[PDB]
Amino acid sequence: MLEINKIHQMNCFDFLDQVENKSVQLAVIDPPYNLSKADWDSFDSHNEFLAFTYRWIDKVLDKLDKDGSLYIFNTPFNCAFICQYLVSKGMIFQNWITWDKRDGMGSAKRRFSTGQETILFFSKSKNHTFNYDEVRVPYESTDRIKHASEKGILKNGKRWFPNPNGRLCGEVWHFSTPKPRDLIERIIRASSNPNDLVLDCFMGSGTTAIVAKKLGRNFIGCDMNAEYVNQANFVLNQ
Amino acid sequence: MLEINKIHQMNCFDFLDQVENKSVQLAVIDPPYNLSKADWDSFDSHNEFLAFTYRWIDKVLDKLDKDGSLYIFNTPFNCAFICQYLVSKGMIFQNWITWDKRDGMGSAKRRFSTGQETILFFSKSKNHTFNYDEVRVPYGILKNGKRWFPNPNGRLCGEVWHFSSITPKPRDLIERIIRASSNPNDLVLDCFMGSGTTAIVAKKLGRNFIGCDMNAEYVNQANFVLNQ
Ligand SMILES: C[S@@+](CC[C@H](N)C(=O)[O-])C[C@H]1O[C@@H](n2cnc3c(N)ncnc32)[C@H](O)[C@@H]1O
Numbered sequence: 001m002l003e004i005n006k007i008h009q010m011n012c013f014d015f016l017d018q019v020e021n022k023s024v025q026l027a028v029i030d031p032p033y034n035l036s037k038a039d040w041d042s043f044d045s046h047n048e049f050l051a052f053t054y055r056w057i058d059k060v061l062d063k064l065d066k067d068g069s070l071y072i073f074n075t076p077f078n079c080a081f082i083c084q085y086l087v088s089k090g091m092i093f094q095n096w097i098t099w100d101k102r103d104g105m106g107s108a109k110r111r112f113s114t115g116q117e118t119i120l121f122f123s124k125s126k127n128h129t130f131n132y133d134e135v136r137v138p139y140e141s142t143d144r145i146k147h148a149s150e151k152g153i154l155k156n157g158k159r160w161f162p163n164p165n166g167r168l169c170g171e172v173w174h175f176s177t178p179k180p181r182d183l184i185e186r187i188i189r190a191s192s193n194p195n196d197l198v199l200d201c202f203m204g205s206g207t208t209a210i211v212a213k214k215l216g217r218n219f220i221g222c223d224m225n226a227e228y229v230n231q232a233n234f235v236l237n238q
Numbered sequence: 239m240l241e242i243n244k245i246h247q248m249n250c251f252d253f254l255d256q257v258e259n260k261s262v263q264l265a266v267i268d269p270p271y272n273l274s275k276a277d278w279d280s281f282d283s284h285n286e287f288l289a290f291t292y293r294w295i296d297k298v299l300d301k302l303d304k305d306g307s308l309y310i311f312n313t314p315f316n317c318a319f320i321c322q323y324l325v326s327k328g329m330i331f332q333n334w335i336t337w338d339k340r341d342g343m344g345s346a347k348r349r350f351s352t353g354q355e356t357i358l359f360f361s362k363s364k365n366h367t368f369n370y371d372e373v374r375v376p377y378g379i380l381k382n383g384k385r386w387f388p389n390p391n392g393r394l395c396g397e398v399w400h401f402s403s404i405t406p407k408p409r410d411l412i413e414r415i416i417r418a419s420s421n422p423n424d425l426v427l428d429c430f431m432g433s434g435t436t437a438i439v440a441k442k443l444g445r446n447f448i449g450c451d452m453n454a455e456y457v458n459q460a461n462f463v464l465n466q
């Protein structure tokens with residue numbers, strides 16, 4: 001039995017083989033993207049990259065319980081292949097999330113400038129957890145116009161007030177190496193509940209564990225890098 | 239003989255077989271999305287929708303010249319499959335364009351609210367036309383620890399696009415595509431013309447066009463607008 005709530009210094013396949021099947025409620029995975037940003041992100045070909053990816057995906061799917069949720073980050077191009085692969089495995093597509101980075105980067109002169117990233121969101125069944133009221137976003141200028149057209153329409157004889165926490169979150173996200181904590185927070189608030197178990201087999205700086213712990217979720221995870229693991233476990237403990 | 243610069247009332251498969259191979263520089267295609275918005279947009283299965291889609295794609299690819307470009311709109315989910323199909327046909331991926339509609343109309347309570355649309359942009363070779371200076375957009379400025387003045391012509395356009403509002407595509411969006419990926423006098427193809435947006439913008443930009451739609455009312459009205 002693998003110790004929960006501590007990041008382990010393990011290869012993802014070794015780690016995954018130690019995880020109990022059907023024990024995980026949410027898996028949030030930011031894996032290699034094949035962009036050659038490091039030795040672990042360099043592959044000989046696109047097929048080798050996909051074979052590696054599909055191998056870890058298969059194991060992660062065995063870990064999810066019957067209604068579990070899955071989020072996988074990658075470039076849009078790699079997500080096209082991963083999306084079709086997940087459909088072929090029986091997973092249920094929920095959303096193609098677009099992270100609009102709006103950074104200063106991506107400049108190109110043979111094509112539009114890059115930088116967006118994709119998050120695929122699938123679930124094991126149609127009875128997954130989706131806490132929509134916990135991830136609402138601030139109302140726009142245009143939501144307020146709609147609010148004005150409905151203000152005079154009474155409900156049950158009285159004025160109706162729209163939710164004070166904002167509008168339902170959509171699929172194109174914009175925020176203020178590690179993923180932004182607010183981004184991972186939206187994922188964990190929407191697709192898990194307090195005390196559920198969250199898995200991340202490429203922990204990196206430990207963002208998934210850190211945010212899971214702050215939100216009262218349990219986590220299980222690993223990274224092959226000793227320095228990253230020790231540094232993240234230290235952050236978790238204070 | 240197939241008339242150039244006219245929208246034809248034809249089925250897309252018959253129309254494409256009349257178009258000469260290797261004659262087109264840019265194809266801008268907004269096809270069925272399988273969202274059941276009409277009889278032509280309703281398929282019995284996803285597999286049937288993909289078989290139909292690959293059939294018209296194969297013919298479109300034959301119409302592009304050796305360095306031609308292709309834009310195909312669809313939902314993100316269907317573009318995942320179309321993207322992989324285009325890669326298997328030897329086309330070169332350039333961008334996964336995200337159209338963020340900023341549509342205030344959310345009501346999903348089982349997943350995030352929908353509305354985004356994707357435009358896949360591929361080329362036949364690495365020597366395609368890409369007029370990056372014709373599609374710059376609006377942004378001293380902090381960048382890398384330094385302070386800079388913006389390029390006065392605007393910044394290079396990226397891949398997540400915001401353009402307000404069958405539902406005809408926004409003329410400004412289609413204009414960005416035709417300015418980026420074609421030149422004056424090139425030929426633009428669209429085999430699912432609908433209201434005629436691709437033809438109208440192409441004509442306003444000094445490009446030639448050819449296209450079709452099976453709907454007689456759409457073709458006549460579009461041809462009306464083009465003639466005026
Ligand atoms: C893109 S990063 C994760 C970043 C993380 N989301 C965070 O916010 O910092 C992927 C991580 O995968 C780890 N890694 C790469 N290949 C691995 C493998 N086969 N097994 C385990 N860890 C691996 C790397 O050491 C790196 O820290």
Ligand SMILES: C[S@@+](CC[C@H](N)C(=O)[O-])C[C@H]1O[C@@H](n2cnc3c(N)ncnc32)[C@H](O)[C@@H]1O
Binds near residue numbers: 268
């Ligand atoms: C999404 S709409 C095109 C909208 C267009 N981009 C516009 O801006 O108005 C798809 C169009 O496909 C046409 N259509 C559907 N199936 C067709 C087929 N097999 N052959 C030809 N036209 C077809 C429909 O009549 C409809 O006008």
Ligand code: NA
Binds near residue numbers: 093315
């Ligand atoms: Na779907």
Ligand code: NA
Binds near residue numbers: 077331
């Ligand atoms: Na690529």
